[PDB]
Amino acid sequence: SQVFGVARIYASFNDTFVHVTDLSGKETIARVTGGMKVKADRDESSPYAAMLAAQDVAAKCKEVGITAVHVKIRATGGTRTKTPGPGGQAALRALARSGLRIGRIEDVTPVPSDSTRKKGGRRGRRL
């Protein structure tokens, strides 16, 4: 029905990323992350900032090619915390409530088979 694209939301901690690209992926459009719409440098990840970024992100998305987008949510991944970031939920909620269509979304965050020993060493990060 509509015209599809890929949301590909990388939500880490202490920042959150949202940009639509072509369904092939090689061509990208309109990024505007969460650290853009506010500078507190702490608040870079906040859900209220993520919504602010989804506002400028959905704006151009319907201002160029896309009436619809498939999303792929992603965490830090690799040897890091692997769990969802704060501004992940906010971005989807805010790009869905922008009227834009949603379908068939999955979790693409990188999963190792336990290698490349993690940082902070054996005794862990302690304070």
Partner: protein, 97 residues
Amino acid sequence: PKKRASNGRNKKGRGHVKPVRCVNCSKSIPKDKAIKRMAIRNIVEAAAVRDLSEASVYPEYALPKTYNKLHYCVSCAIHARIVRVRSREDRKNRAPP
């Protein structure tokens, strides 16, 4: 004196297991001692469940949630997640709830 017949945690007749890393403070810790939790949570939530199937294509879709294992360091499992602390005889109880 010995405060646990499990000692730290369950390994018996093995003598070496292999350590995992804390998902929080990244401390090493034997898998037998790991204090593990399954994370079962929807990609969406209580708020966005409606806003999901509303503005979206497909008949209500699927809603394919996300699952991963968590490992904690004690000191970091004590700091937050299932620990509390328990009485002399409350300790022994292995009941999950």
